[model samples]
Target chain A: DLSPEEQIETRQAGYAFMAWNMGKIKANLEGEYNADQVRAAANVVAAIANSGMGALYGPGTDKNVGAVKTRAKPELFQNLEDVGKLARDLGTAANALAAAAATGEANAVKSAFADVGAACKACHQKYRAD
Target chain B: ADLSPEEQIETRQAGYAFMAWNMGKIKANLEGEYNADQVRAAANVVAAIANSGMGALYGPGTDKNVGAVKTRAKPELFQNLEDVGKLARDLGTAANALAAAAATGEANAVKSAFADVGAACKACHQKYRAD
Candidate 1:
């Protein structure tokens, strides 16, 4: 296990990748409808949602735990069930988006992307600082 | 909007940092502190990034230079274009295999897949990255 500080850095880097890939998905969807790019971006989102996120929320890593710098709300630590559900929802939606993107069907991709966006918003609404 | 050179460099750095971060997670899992979900997740991220059209970020003249933006990428990356492209494509193939294996929740399968992915990364780093 990494130290608390190292965990924070790791978490930040993972999210940075998530956000970057999300940008790629959106750019392709809005501009070129590039199926390959959209599928790749969606796949990253699914991967991060399912596994890369577990290490970031270890005990004592939250803001309520007296961490120096963290954007997670104390409620996130206090409410495991809700957070887990949201994370699972994100995983499901991201996987759906990846599948849709692979089909090269713009409407299907858009619908799946909306589910992903909504799942993220639901989690950020309760757990994130901003 | 097209990214400026600085933006391109930053994007490249961010992609690699993402890779390194997920690699650490997978290493932890492989060392007997198992978490199949985490392994699958990290491997998927690697695959996604590998195919994420990141090649655009490595446009002409982005290699390391004195008094310029610092980067670990060696100048040989620009010169050996075909080799770099081949290695990158191989990395994607290996990453996808790892991701698929990880999703099976089988430790031994993931372990074998991880080795392949690591070899692909090392092959590229040995040639392209500056120490």
Candidate 2:
């Protein structure tokens, strides 16, 4: 059981790591299109997306408890089923992105990449604070 | 597969970032409510990445001072490969021990092992990393 504060930190670190890899993939797709680089970044995204990050969300994590601030909105915890579904969607999309990137084709990778982005947006749009 | 110097730096850095993320999870759990399952998961990630051949990623032409790429790995890290490799091995061993302790579900043991892992991390960072 992580303290609510620690839960916040861990989730933030996880999302930050994901965002960092996504940035790499986005840059590669837009710029030089390094297939290997894209593949590596996509693989990281897929792995983390499937890594069961939901464990960090326990009771009391939904709101700021003193110094432990969480950007997770209250609605994020209301329906665990929806959160889990979105989590799986992100994982599937990430896996597809990785597979597409491995083909060394920029267009295919970016096409799948859209799904991954939308999955992320779907969750944050509903759950996370601005 | 072969990786360019820049690619090596990027990949290795990402691996470190993920490991640190896990470390924070374990630290938070320890300070708050003790959760064996969570600690085990985090410890597994740390051990896996510590054992990954990240040592080799600092290959030729990868040092910022030596040739290409903008890596924060100290130039001396290459010069002291023997010691750095030793520290890397120690971290792997410590991380695995942390996982083993977490699996045992003994809070005291987990605390001991977690501190060891943190110590190993700091030892390496102080010696090898540039910033």
Candidate 3:
């Protein structure tokens, strides 16, 4: 298990990577659509959503656990089901986006991307602290 | 307008930081924490970043001293663009392999794939990066 501080840091770092990949996807979506690049970025989001981020929320690492510098709200621990549901939705949407991107169909990818964005927004609205 | 050389350097640094963060995720799993999902996630991120066509960020005039940025990239990188491109492509291949192995939830396979990825990075750093 990681130390509480390490856990917070790791979670932040993971999110940073997610943001980076998302930026790539957004840039392609808004400008020229590059199927390979879009697929790659979507795959990263799906992978992180499905597997890479769960452990970062282990018990004792939440906002109330200690004096850690985290943007995760204390309500996240209290509303585990809601948070988990949003995460699962994100994974599902991201996987869909990846598949759509692979087909190189702009419309399909745009539709899927909206779902991914919505899932992220839903989670952040409730779980993230400014 | 196109980014200045300093902006380009910052972009490259940001990309590297993303790769390093994902690498940390892989390391945590390999050290016996053993989360297959996390491994897959991190490997996928590495693969994505590798294939993201970030070459524009290292365009001409972005090298250290030529730009308003300080970087660990040696001027030799510009001199040996083909070699650097090959290393980058190799890293992408290895990263894809790692992502595939992680998806199968096979720890040993992931380990083998990770080694190849690491070797690719080390080879590039040895030739192109400053000490």
Q: What is the lDDT of candidate 1?
A: 0.79
Deviation of model 1 at A90, angstroms? 2.2
Which candidate would rank higher by TM-score, 2 or 3? Answer: 3
Docking class of 1: medium
- Report the C-alpha lDDT of model 3 over B39-106, residue by residue, as the tens digit: 87788878776776667678877876644457888989999988899999998889888888888998
Which candidate, 1 or 3, would have the higher TM-score against the true structure? Answer: 1
Number of clashing residue pairs in every model? 0, 1, 0
The order by descending DockQ is 1, 3, 2
Please give the TM-score for the first chain of candidate 3. 0.89
For model 1, the stretches where C-alpha displacement exceeds 4 angstroms are: A59-69, A73-81, B33-38, B60-70, B103-106
lDDT of 1 at A103: 77
The superposed Cα distance between candidate 1 and the true structure at residue B23, in angstroms, equals 3.3
Better of 2 and 3 by lDDT: 2
Candidate 1 reference-contact recovery: 0.61
Off by over 4 Å in 2: B1-17, B20-123, B126-131
The parts of candidate 3 lying over 4 Å away from their true place are A59-68, B1-42, B56-83, B103-108, B127-131
Lowest-scoring 10 consecutive residues by lDDT in candidate 1 chain B? Answer: B60-69
